[PDB]
Design a protein around this nucleic acid. Structure first.
Ligand SMILES: [Mg+2]
Ligand SMILES: [Mg+2]
Ligand SMILES: [Mg+2]
Ligand SMILES: [Mg+2]
Ligand SMILES: [Mg+2]
Ligand SMILES: [Mg+2]
Ligand SMILES: [Mg+2]
Ligand SMILES: [Mg+2]
Ligand SMILES: [Mg+2]
Ligand SMILES: [Mg+2]
Ligand SMILES: [Mg+2]
Ligand SMILES: [Mg+2]
Ligand SMILES: [Mg+2]
Ligand SMILES: [Mg+2]
Ligand SMILES: [Mg+2]
Ligand SMILES: [Mg+2]
Ligand SMILES: [Mg+2]
Ligand SMILES: [Mg+2]
Ligand SMILES: [Mg+2]
Ligand SMILES: [Mg+2]
Ligand SMILES: [Mg+2]
Ligand SMILES: [Mg+2]
Ligand SMILES: [Mg+2]
Ligand SMILES: [Mg+2]
Ligand SMILES: [Zn+2]
Lengths: 144, 140, 129, 102, 72, 55, 81, 141
RNA sequence: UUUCAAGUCGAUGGAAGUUUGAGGCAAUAACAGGUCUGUGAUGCCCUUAGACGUUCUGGGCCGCACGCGCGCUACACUGACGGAGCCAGCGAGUAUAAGCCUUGGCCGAGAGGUCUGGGAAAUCUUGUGAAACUCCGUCGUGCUGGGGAUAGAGCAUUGUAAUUGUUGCUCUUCAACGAGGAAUUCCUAGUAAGCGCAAGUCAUCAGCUUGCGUUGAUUACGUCCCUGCCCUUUGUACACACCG
């Protein structure tokens, strides 16, 4: 509840899940740099890890940093609701998952060929690079 | 009963009904003291009818108003009118008219809307545009 | 972050859909199958199956029974392209109307749970120039 | 089933006949010593319909704004049921309709 | 991009704050940011404590604006 | 057989579910106050119904 | 059945508009001017104004008798109503 | 003369009743308060994670004090706000039903409110007693 | 002031002193203006049983290298979020249906579900406790907590039927955009601008119209410089009238 000082404990650059995080960002919004971690998700893992949101990224100790990456990789074990997850009711094993920085584009990709392998209409328009959700195309999306 | 006069003030849609009774000087807005009106930056709009005449005028009378309709700002102007009109109307009926004409002089010389309701109302919208005078942008 | 490794493992993996592998998937009744797919499919079967989807399934079943040297089960044609693919009809071949022609599709296992007309585009793609 | 608190509801589009029937009933409820409550002017309802002027879709976008005012009045009477109904036949008017509810 | 304002308070800057803020006609969130090179959030906690420590007198209190002056 | 196909598609809750009193049209219907009249048919009958232009 | 006040006054007007055009098409040759619907207890008085009240009331009033029957059968009215 | 809820500013009265309700500790807090957002129109959960439920329950109690048989559906509309539809214009959307219903249900077992006849939730015989008390311990400074 | 005329500008009184504010109606003629896709309004031509009638099924009217117009979000700090404060008006609403407005209670993070009750209505939904707005906090000039396209996975609603996602909800991805060239539109007081709400379409869908109210200004109250139109004079070999 007052200004405090520290020396040598701040860490300017963090590395979490093979992603570089700026250490002078507030912890809740620093994790949003990790792809697959939005503002809504980052708010809860810090609250489940008892990391008060009033701390910058470099303020955290190693003990706290490992406690966060553990929760993100195992969300359901920490009373994180299934509906709150990124990839729930998975295609192959049917369980609720939350894919992260490097895993996200791999399983996002696997969904694309899975649409394209069966040659569905939605997968085809994805192949063409067009809008797949029915949006009009006669007058919008003319950039490159 | 007792010496009671009832009046009202109005703005665009807001209407504030003021009851002025004889008493110790109780002045409430919808059952709450005027010292706690929400629009703080406008709290002096309702303080004006008080400090203009002097709080000594309110020793013998208590005022309870009920303001409904309009908006947040439109309600403030409705309240201050009901109070100003209520103080004048009580003097005309239970005090000599010389004093009533004195109070009305200070009020009118400061702000006409303290006693006279503003007649401005919203102009109806006309087709061919999104507003009363505004029109859809034209192309050739 | 500690570390990470990705050594993917197998065991003669059979294709699997939401935790149910192909062997058990195909002989599950369609009443049980809909309980493990999306919200739209679950709603559709609760709303009541009219005679049209059920009639196509009966013909599709017979078309497979027509051939027992284990080749393709001959084509059943249909207009009803709001049909939801079920594991029962895997391997059958259906002709799905796109408004003009009978597009022919073979029901692969990964097609299960999808709409039958989603694999027959109704418009020839635009080609400028 | 004698003297009752009886409601007569008056609705019409035009006010001249509505006030004549309303006043005529009040007049007959005066010389007859029957206590009465009314008439009560209900807030008039403005039925508004806004169409396009063009039967086609050509020209400036001009609109008609039609209206149908409905005026409703209720009058409370303290009299036996036989007396109130015959009053209605005395003050019968084509435009105004009457409904009686106990 | 050129801002790079300091968000962590070390000891060299801390006593520099207590040595420089008293010699200001008017201090605010922007005044602290403009001249002390500290961040806005760090300025807000600094203002709320310097007032509690008596060095700074609150001229006006508001969420969006904090008007303060020297207490000497 | 044919009677089960002829005019078999549902024609409720749709634009084709209703029509003008006057012209039996499907487009530009006015359903307010249970008029069920075409917007063109309404204009040529508005005075008779009791709708007048005042403002 | 149970009809709202807004929807009842409109229905009376719509009934008038449809009834008025019916006379214009049927009694066009008799100079039809207009119709007045005088509601009354136990009866629905209808006054039609025409240049010639013989074509409507012809051959022992057969046409007007056969014309009021076309309205009872279309608006589900009692024959005496 | 006495003191009532209407004689104290609303904003700092709730901050005082919220403090009492947290320190008293008898109010039952549902287990999802650290996860949920107040409204479907909101995009983030409340910033005061430890205290937001207490303050909202304090707000609910004060709002019910000034009125008669307010329902739980009306509470969702009151605390609801403008939704940030992306490119479409803004619109008012009601708040979450469970959060308001749990508060009034939680407040019903702490003794401040009760189900009123002809719908709604009245303030309790003791509900008037203890709110007017907090007002007195608000204005002494 | 004025031809002391019609009037105009200031004050005072007044609720109102711009025709008191706003509209509805609106002349003599005319256009090859638009509609036979509003009509069981129509002349003529075409078709009339392998129909161009009508009906059923499915698709399309949304289709995408592009140009143009009406708009909605925004590019942030006069701000975003998070809590808290908490104010309108115009209106609409059903039955043996083919189902209306729906409070209140109970489930659900939500969307939504369920049980009762009220209202054919100044009675109930409804004080439609709307949003901008205000207070207190977090953020701190950073493509950032601005912006929320695009897309993956999942949950509900309507409907016979949602695939070419009807709509709504949850998590995630988080693009151009850092105030916009030549040009060009609307507008003078409760007006402009924001800001929402209701009614129409409507089983579902409002970034649309028609209205309504909340907050509420800057700047003229002048001119013919541009533009359009009217009048007078003029020329005319035009009068089907310069599309001569
Ligand atoms: Mg076809
Ligand atoms: Mg609100
Ligand atoms: Mg709010
Ligand atoms: Mg926004
Ligand atoms: Mg937006
Ligand atoms: Mg006028
Ligand atoms: Mg023409
Ligand atoms: Mg032409
Ligand atoms: Mg035709
Ligand atoms: Mg035709
Ligand atoms: Mg039509
Ligand atoms: Mg044919
Ligand atoms: Mg189109
Ligand atoms: Mg298409
Ligand atoms: Mg336009
Ligand atoms: Mg806010
Ligand atoms: Mg009401
Ligand atoms: Mg999005
Ligand atoms: Mg961003
Ligand atoms: Mg122009
Ligand atoms: Mg649609
Ligand atoms: Mg609508
Ligand atoms: Mg439209
Ligand atoms: Mg000449
Ligand atoms: Zn019609």
């Amino acid at each position: 509840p007052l200004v405090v000082q520290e020396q040598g404990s701040f860490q300017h650059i963090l590395r979490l899940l093979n992603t570089n995080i700026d250490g002078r960002i507030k912890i809740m919004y620093a994790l949003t740099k990790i792809r697959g971690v939005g503002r809504r998700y980052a708010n809860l893992v810090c609250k489940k890890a008892d990391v008060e949101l009033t701390k910058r990224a470099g303020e955290l100790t190693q003990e706290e940093l490992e406690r966060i990456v553990t929760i993100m990789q195992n969300p359901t074990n920490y009373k994180i609701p299934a509906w709150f997850l990124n990839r729930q009711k998975d295609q192959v094993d049917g369980k609720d998952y939350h894919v992260l920085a490097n895993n996200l584009e791999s399983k996002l990709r696997d969904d694309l060929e899975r649409l394209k392998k069966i040659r569905s209409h939605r997968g085809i328009r994805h192949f063409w690079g067009l809008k797949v959700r029915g949006q009009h195309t006669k007058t919008t999306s003319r950039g490159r | 009963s007792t010496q009671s006069v009832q009046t009202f003030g109005k703005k665009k849609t807001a209407t504030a009904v003021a009851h002025v009774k004889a008493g110790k000087g109780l002045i409430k807005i919808n059952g709450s003291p005027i010292t706690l009106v929400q629009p703080e930056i406008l709290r002096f709009k309702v303080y004006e009818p008080l400090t203009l005449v002097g709080l000594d005028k309110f020793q013998g009378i208590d005022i309870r108003v009920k303001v409904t309709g309009g908006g947040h700002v439109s309600q403030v102007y409705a309240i201050r009118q009901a109070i100003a009109k209520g103080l004048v109307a009580y003097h005309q009926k239970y005090v000599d008219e010389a004093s009533k004409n004195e109070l009305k002089k200070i009020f009118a010389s400061y702000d006409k809307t303290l006693l006279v309701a503003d007649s401005r109302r919203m102009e109806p919208k006309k087709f061919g545009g999104r507003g009363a005078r505004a029109r859809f942008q034209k192309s050739y | 972050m500690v570390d990470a490794t990705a050594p993917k493992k197998r065991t003669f993996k059979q294709f699997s859909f939401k935790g149910v592998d192909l062997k058990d998937l195909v002989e599950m009744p369609t009443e049980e199958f809909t309980k493990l797919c999306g919200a739209r499919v679950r709603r559709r079967f609760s709303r009541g199956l009219d005679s049209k989807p059920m009639g196509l399934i009966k013909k599709l079943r017979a078309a497979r029974a027509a051939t027992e040297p284990n080749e393709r089960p001959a084509v059943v044609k249909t207009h009803l392209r709001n049909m939801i693919v079920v594991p029962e009809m895997i391997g059958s071949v259906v002709g799905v109307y796109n408004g003009k022609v009978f597009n022919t599709v073979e029901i692969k296992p990964e097609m299960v749970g999808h709409y039958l007309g989603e694999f027959s585009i109704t418009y020839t793609p635009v080609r400028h120039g | 089933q004698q003297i009752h608190k009886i409601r007569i509801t008056l609705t019409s589009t035009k006010v001249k006949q509505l006030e004549n029937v309303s006043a005529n009933i009040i007049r007959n409820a005066a010389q007859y010593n029957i206590v009465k409550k009314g008439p009560v002017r209900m807030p008039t309802k403005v039925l508004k319909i806004t169409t396009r002027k063009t039967p086609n879709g050509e020209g400036s976008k001009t609109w008609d704004a039609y209206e149908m005012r409905i005026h409703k009045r209720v009058i409370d009477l303290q009299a036996p049921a036989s007396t109130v109904k015959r009053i209605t036949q005395i003050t019968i008017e084509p435009g105004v309709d009457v409904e009686v509810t106990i | 991009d050129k801002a790079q304002h300091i968000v962590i308070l070390d000891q060299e800057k801390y006593d520099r704050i207590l040595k420089d803020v008293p010699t200001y006609k008017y201090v605010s969130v922007s005044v602290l940011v403009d001249r002390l090179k500290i961040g806005g959030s760090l300025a807000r906690v600094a203002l709320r404590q310097l007032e509690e420590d008596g060095i700074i007198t609150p001229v006006l209190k508001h969420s969006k604006q904090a008007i303060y002056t020297r207490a000497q | 057989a044919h009677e089960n196909v002829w005019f078999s598609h549902p024609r409720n809750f749709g634009k084709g579910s209703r029509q003008c009193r006057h012209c039996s049209s499907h487009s530009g219907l006015i359903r307010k106050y249970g008029l069920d009249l075409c917007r063109q048919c309404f204009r040529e009958k508005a005075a008779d119904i009791g709708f007048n232009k005042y403002r | 059945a149970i009809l709202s006040k807004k929807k009842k006054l409109v229905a009376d007007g719509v009934f008038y508009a449809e009834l008025n055009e019916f006379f214009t098409r049927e009694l066009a040759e008799q100079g039809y001017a207009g119709v007045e619907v005088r509601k009354t207890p136990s009866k629905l008085e209808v006054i039609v104004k025409a240049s010639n009240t013989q074509g409507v009331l012809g051959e022992q009033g057969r046409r007007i008798h056969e014309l009021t029957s076309l309205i009872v059968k279309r608006f589900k009215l009692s024959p005496e109503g | 003369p006495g003191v009532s809820v209407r004689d104290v500013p609303a904003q700092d009265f709730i901050n005082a009743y919220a403090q009492f309700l947290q320190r008293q500790g008898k109010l039952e807090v549902p287990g999802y308060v650290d996860i949920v957002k107040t409204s479907a129109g909101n995009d983030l959960p409340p910033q005061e994670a430890e205290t937001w439920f207490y303050k909202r329950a304090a707000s609910i109690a004060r709002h019910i004090y000034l009125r008669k048989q307010v329902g739980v559906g009306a509470l969702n509309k009151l605390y609801g706000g403008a939704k940030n539809r992306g490119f479409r214009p803004h619109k008012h959307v009601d708040a979450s039903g469970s959060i308001n219903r749990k508060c009034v249900q939680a407040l019903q077992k702490i003794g401040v409110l009760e189900i009123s006849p002809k719908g709604g939730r009245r303030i309790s015989e003791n509900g008037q007693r203890d709110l007017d008390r907090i007002a007195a311990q608000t204005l002494e400074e």
